[PDB]
Amino acid sequence: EHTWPDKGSLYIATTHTQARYALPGVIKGFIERYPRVSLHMHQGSPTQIAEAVSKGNADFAIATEALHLYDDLVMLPCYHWNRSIVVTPDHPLAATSSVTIEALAQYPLVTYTFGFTGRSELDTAFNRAGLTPRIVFTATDADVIKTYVRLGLGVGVIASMAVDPLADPDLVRIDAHDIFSHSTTKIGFRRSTFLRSYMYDFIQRFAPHLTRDVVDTAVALRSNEEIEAMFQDIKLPEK
Amino acid sequence: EHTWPDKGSLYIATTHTQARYALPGVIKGFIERYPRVSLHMHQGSPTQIAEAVSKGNADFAIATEALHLYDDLVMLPCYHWNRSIVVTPDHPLAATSSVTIEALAQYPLVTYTFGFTGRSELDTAFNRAGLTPRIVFTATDADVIKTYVRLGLGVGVIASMAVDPLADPDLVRIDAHDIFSHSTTKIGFRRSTFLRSYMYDFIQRFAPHLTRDVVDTAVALRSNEEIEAMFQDIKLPEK
Numbered sequence A, B: 001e002h003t004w005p006d007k008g009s010l011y012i013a014t015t016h017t018q019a020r021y022a023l024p025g026v027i028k029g030f031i032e033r034y035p036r037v038s039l040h041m042h043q044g045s046p047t048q049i050a051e052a053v054s055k056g057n058a059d060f061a062i063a064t065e066a067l068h069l070y071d072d073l074v075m076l077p078c079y080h081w082n083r084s085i086v087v088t089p090d091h092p093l094a095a096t097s098s099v100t101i102e103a104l105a106q107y108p109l110v111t112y113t114f115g116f117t118g119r120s121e122l123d124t125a126f127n128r129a130g131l132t133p134r135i136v137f138t139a140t141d142a143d144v145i146k147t148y149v150r151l152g153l154g155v156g157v158i159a160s161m162a163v164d165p166l167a168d169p170d171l172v173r174i175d176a177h178d179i180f181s182h183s184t185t186k187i188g189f190r191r192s193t194f195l196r197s198y199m200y201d202f203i204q205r206f207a208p209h210l211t212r213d214v215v216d217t218a219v220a221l222r223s224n225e226e227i228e229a230m231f232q233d234i235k236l237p238e239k
């Protein structure tokens, strides 16, 4: 068929959100193409993942947040993303349209946990507005979040790609584009790492703008600052 | 209605499996009963959770695994549980009936991650049988596991309570009672922690055998060994 005889290994250390909503499509198309490549996927917290990759079990690091601290690995930007609001139909916010961050700060919150950017761009959203949010639930999975929202435990704040009406019919989705700054999902990998052809192909599928010539140009650069100062002129995918 | 005016707080640090399949029922019945109790649920890794509770942010610790290392907190046993095998209909194991651990060690594995008992009683299942399992996927969520099984990435090994035919119709469930030793979900909490009445009620809902007189008897005991040497005569719930 349309397969490559490429023999090698690919270890990906990523988070739950990426593994659940962003990767499944890329992974299937990859394994159909590279049958002789042993694909490993491990998950996954921004601290470990940053750990597993710098030294040195995983090849690539797919996460939003804390990678750096590690200055060791090249970083490329994959997409931007922002969170939506999920509530039950009986909840006030399902009646009110276009909500502010002050109106949201009234209710018990059900969001991500500390260490994940779904929060980090959330903690400094209230800090800035001089607000203290009542967060009664923190988790890494949005399904668990969406679960406890249905119980009427509190208002849910999850990634937009984690909520779908076919999948989630009983919940009212409220876009929070303006309320929160968008988060940037990146891909991390050491410089010593020899980039195989299937690795470029994977990066391509996950981030279309990251073609082979683009990756090589960012890699050869001194630091990750020049890399991020290379993409400020281009509009990355928003999901 | 049937509510209590009890005012207080309840912080639960638990894992994903517990929060997704074991707790939702208990949580709803609790919040309906204690409206003036601020219920907080945070998740969750056996190391943190053990951390958040010993010192000292969370009141209770609901996890299978590594709690101890902390000798600080009382432990009570809640239930036993074991894992099942999930595959696609086209997979050989869907044809073969009653599989051994040697027949399972043939395939790429999609199970939990290191630090979670879904693995710990899995790593020493092959070690013992003198076997090396090919684990190509590790995660904390069974939904992600079940997801990548459908891609034909490998054979899935998840908790039995995480698989249901209404919920998961396309996957073939294979019970592994004999293959793996059952894991024990426990509840952890410091001795300094004053046990409120609603706390006993919660423990009761999560573990029926743990009535107030049973909890007090285990708490007052020297160590957690006497506690586990108090329940070897009783058959705990298996889920």
Ligand SMILES: CC(=O)N[C@@H](CO)C(=O)O
Binding pocket: A021, A022, A023, A025, A026, A161, A205, A206, A239
């Ligand atoms: C179609 C698809 O899989 N898209 C991913 C990104 O590639 C997402 O984030 O939704």
Ligand SMILES: CC(=O)N[C@@H](CO)C(=O)O
Binding pocket: A015, A016, A017, A018, A046, A062, A063, A064, A065, A112, A116, A117, A118, A119, A140, A141, A159
């Ligand atoms: C950590 C996680 O499960 N999800 C997001 C954060 O919301 C990510 O860091 O990719």
Ligand SMILES: CC(=O)N[C@@H](CO)C(=O)O
Binding pocket: B021, B022, B023, B025, B026, B161, B205, B206, B239
């Ligand atoms: C009915 C229910 O919620 N049972 C839990 C335990 O209470 C389970 O483990 O399935």
Ligand SMILES: CC(=O)N[C@@H](CO)C(=O)O
Binding pocket: B015, B016, B017, B018, B046, B062, B063, B064, B065, B112, B116, B117, B118, B119, B140, B141, B159
């Ligand atoms: C850690 C997790 O998500 N689940 C189980 C382990 O399989 C538990 O420790 O309770």
